[PDB]
Amino acid sequence: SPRFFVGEPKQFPVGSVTTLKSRKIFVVRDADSFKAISVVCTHLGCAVEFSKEKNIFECPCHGSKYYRNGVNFAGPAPRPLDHLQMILDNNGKLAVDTSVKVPLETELIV
Amino acid sequence: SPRFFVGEPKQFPVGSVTTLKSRKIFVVRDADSFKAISVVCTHLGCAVEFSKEKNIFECPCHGSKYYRNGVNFAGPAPRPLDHLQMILDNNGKLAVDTSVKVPLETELIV
Amino acid sequence: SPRFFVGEPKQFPVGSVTTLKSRKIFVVRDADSFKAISVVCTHLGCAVEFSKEKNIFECPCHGSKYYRNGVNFAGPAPRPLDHLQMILDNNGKLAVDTSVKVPLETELIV
Amino acid sequence: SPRFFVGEPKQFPVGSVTTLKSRKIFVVRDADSFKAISVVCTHLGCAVEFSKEKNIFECPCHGSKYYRNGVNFAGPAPRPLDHLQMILDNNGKLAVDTSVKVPLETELIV
Amino acid sequence: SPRFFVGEPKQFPVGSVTTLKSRKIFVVRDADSFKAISVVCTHLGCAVEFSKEKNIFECPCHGSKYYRNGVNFAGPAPRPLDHLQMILDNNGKLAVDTSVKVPLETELIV
Amino acid sequence: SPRFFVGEPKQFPVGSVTTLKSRKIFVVRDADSFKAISVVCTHLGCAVEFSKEKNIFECPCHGSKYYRNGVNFAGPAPRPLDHLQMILDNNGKLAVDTSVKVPLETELIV
Amino acid sequence: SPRFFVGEPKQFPVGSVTTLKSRKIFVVRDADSFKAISVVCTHLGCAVEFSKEKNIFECPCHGSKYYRNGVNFAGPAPRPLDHLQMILDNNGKLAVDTSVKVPLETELIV
Amino acid sequence: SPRFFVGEPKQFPVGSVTTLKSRKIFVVRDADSFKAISVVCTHLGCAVEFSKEKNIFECPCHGSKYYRNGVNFAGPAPRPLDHLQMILDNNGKLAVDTSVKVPLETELIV
Amino acid sequence: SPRFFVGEPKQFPVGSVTTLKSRKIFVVRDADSFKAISVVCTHLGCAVEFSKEKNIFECPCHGSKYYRNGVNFAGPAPRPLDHLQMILDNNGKLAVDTSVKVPLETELIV
Amino acid sequence: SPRFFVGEPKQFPVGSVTTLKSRKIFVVRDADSFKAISVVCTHLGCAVEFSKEKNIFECPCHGSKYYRNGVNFAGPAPRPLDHLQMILDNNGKLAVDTSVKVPLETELIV
Amino acid sequence: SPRFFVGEPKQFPVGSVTTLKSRKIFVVRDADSFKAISVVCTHLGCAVEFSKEKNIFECPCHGSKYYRNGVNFAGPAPRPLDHLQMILDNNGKLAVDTSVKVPLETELIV
Amino acid sequence: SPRFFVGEPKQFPVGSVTTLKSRKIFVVRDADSFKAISVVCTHLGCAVEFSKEKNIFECPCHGSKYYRNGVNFAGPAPRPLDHLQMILDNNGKLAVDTSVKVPLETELIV
Numbered sequence A, B, C, D, E, F, G, H, I, J, K, L: 001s002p003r004f005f006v007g008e009p010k011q012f013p014v015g016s017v018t019t020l021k022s023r024k025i026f027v028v029r030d031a032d033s034f035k036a037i038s039v040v041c042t043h044l045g046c047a048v049e050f051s052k053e054k055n056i057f058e059c060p061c062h063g064s065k066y067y068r069n070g071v072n073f074a075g076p077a078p079r080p081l082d083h084l085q086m087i088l089d090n091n092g093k094l095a096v097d098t099s100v101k102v103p104l105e106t107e108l109i110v
Ligand code: FES
Pocket: A041, A042, A043, A044, A045, A046, A047, A059, A060, A061, A062, A063, A064, A075, A076, A077
């Protein structure tokens, strides 16, 4: 299913990028702002990996690189990573919908 | 309460702008894309009104005017109209969160 | 410190909004009622500025707008500005404690 | 004629002072309370202007100053500005009778 | 009541400035000439205070300053302090009418 | 003895100059502003006379002429005519004190 | 040059206000008392003209008005007209220093 | 109709922009240089307004902005504001002709 | 001058924002969609700069900030950046007309 | 070819709607603003015809009706008529590209 | 140090007066011309402030007023504000030397 | 005899009160402002003496005490010390005229 819960905002450290391999998403929290970024490389579909030390997203298939917000700056990647719809449910749980693409600037503050 | 249901997607005609006075929002449907736009003028807070013939939003207070997308072009309004988070709930009804403002180009496909 | 003096009531004009940039608060006097409003924008935390010309609060970071009482009406601000505890000390000076938030329409009559 | 319409409440911003120079009155809206104040200075009869920046009324003829409520505090003005009868008509229009002067604290809630 | 008695000429020392806080006036005696000066700052209405050593009036709100005669020289004050009507009554007591403002150069000899 | 009552403001037409020969004063009413002007010519002391047509004061002794405000403009008159203290007593009657000279711009509003 | 002669005391009539457009000052003689007053309006600097009939100074730009002593009472002028240093030279001619401003009550008797 | 008087050079402050709404022109004075600028926006013909605070011209219809000299820099305005001919009549009156458009660099020195 | 070529579509990388300082415009390519955006800040006219990492336009003068599409969100900028008419000429190279502003959502696909 | 010329701007009277059957477009002139609107009904593709008497576009197939700007308001038409790219070439004739759709608010000023 | 950097010419709007409060200077840019004006009032040394609304410099200590070019016209200020040395460094940075005063007519064009 | 010179501004240190008993005046220098104050006690005419320690003027005859500006505060002295006319002659020497008394707030800045 594209729609699913990810956890309460407390399960995510401030300034952390959490990788959900099965869900095909990153959960990026900056201060109190939350973002959901897809792991799918925009080149041919490989799974991008985040490096904490380099603070970038890197594709091991053809060397595409993305900044923390997902914008492509190196490699054959032609466009930024897809940002996904993320809401806080009525019971304090974060919900992500991979079927709903959102503009890159979208953020969820808690 | 800023969180509330708005109706099923089919209660909104294709290519129509629906004014929900009580909820102080607009529900704009273009083809199958839905947007939620606040009625509050970004100047001093008056409730703007949509003109179907002129295809623009007009404020009754000092004459600020916005395009269909919410971009301000006339009057002292310094910002575009606020776009609001709108989700499709599993019970088939559209829900709007007034407290969550979203980027201008956000859309929900059905 | 969260606790500090802001001056005597006679130092504040009737119908005035006084910005204490160091203390990061506003002192609002309407007739004989005094209010303490925090400058911290409820969006991402920037310091809002009061527009004497437009009688509203403006945040320069993302364009949030608040009414004189602190209630937001435009921009990404989700909730009204924080009102702070304000007491009249024995020595005739007004004392504000930013650590104690008070309801929106709280007021100190003198 | 001493009776005229001034518009619907939705045409007046919250916390605004509107000058109707032809009608020679002010329309003051605080929250949902409406007040009608005459522009005639109580000194020698000149037309008083409202200063949005200073939140006061000032007469250009001899320098009288009035608080936002119309009470004089500086200049040769002897008594506060006249407040006028303001009614909400059944057709949603605000009606003012400038020949009927009302007490200072009179207000119309909507 | 704006009309009130203030006292006989002998209760005010020669070359003294007497502050009537409750009456919101100054009684200035130079030799045998008496003057009644209002305490209200012509900027936004705060109560100014007289400094005998500096021989000037100072407003505690925004730093407007007035000379002994009431002429403003510092701060945003756009007008001199209001001079008030003062008479010597039948019973030898001075009466002040704050509702009657008099030109700056007015004086009462005894 | 030099203090005396002159009558109620109703006994003086608007825009009229009334000569009180036994009181050696004028009572000038413009709209609702009253002035008390001495009839003593500032040249050698003759009694000046007002012309309702020419709207000026004329001295028949040596041809000195004064404006309605008392300003000398013709003849050997060195000064303007003296303005005198005039108050509205508690019993609604106008009182003039010829022993108390006031600045030329003094006026009494009723 | 700021310093210059304006003539001998007897070249100025008693009770006269003489305008010296060449030097942009007024020479006011009341009996034997002389004053030097600048023509520059304290608002935005226009040349003020004296009306002998009204006995006031008037600015042609935005309607500021001053009394004979220079005190502002009408218009946006926030300060009285500047009074200038004036001495009686040994050779019997009056000298004015425009660069040296003096208190408003200053007078030079000859 | 296209030729009319606007007043004498003494009626315009140094470094001022004067708006003549009834005549649809601006009078700009820098030092002793006078310029006439048309208020007609070069976009679709609305009347532009001068912002004293921002030292720019603003059109309220579609948000075009012009510098003080009339050159457009923002908005759909394609060309700078029209400069109009201004002559100094030999009787001391300034005359403008809105029908005669002149280069932006032309000026009338007095 | 307002009309000029900018080059062929192949000379602009996919997902790139190229700044043409000489012509004071941006050429934005998203996939095969092209856009011409002016560099002039809609506040006071300074040249904004694009941050590839932050994916925003920033004004160096007073801190106005714009999204990739030109929508203003920070600073005193009251309107979005101007979008410009851009054509693909017959000889295969793109042409821009600075004099012709087009709606914000305009795009040229190749 | 979808890129064709239409004539000079003066070939179209002010306030006219010109239907070009062979080119499948409308040319709309309001004052000096030009628009190119496609005749294709957005329902099933019939050629829409304009009515001058009632200032609307009408599809003869199933009764779809559009406002003068192309906005659909009657019939099964789900979206407004397509607006087309229209530029003024160097040779003084307008060029239309039916293959380049533009936003509804696009206009060409001459 | 009296000599310090101010920034790049791109950081200053056209036709602007920029206040560097900590450095006690103004930076005035007209077109491509730059000038530096000291904030020290020539009266007694207080820091003057620029009024964007009135396009003048104001000193709060004794009410001195200066034109935009810095010359005094009202108040006890005896001489115009000081202009300061301003040089363009070969690394593209503007530098001001507080200790080196230059004539008002000196300008730095870029 | 009463019109005598005192010396160049060099010979008076900053913040000093120099007693000239043969000329019977004080010379007070605050920063660059000079004042000439008579030594004659307002009580009966004894020569008061300045105490650099207590920063006051004291009369040895009956205990009258003045503030540094000449304002009387102790003893039977009824009015402040006389301030005398002081001018800077073109040869760099200050000239004092004991026959010309000036307001207390008079100052001479060099
Ligand atoms: S699939 Fe990711 S870089 Fe190619």
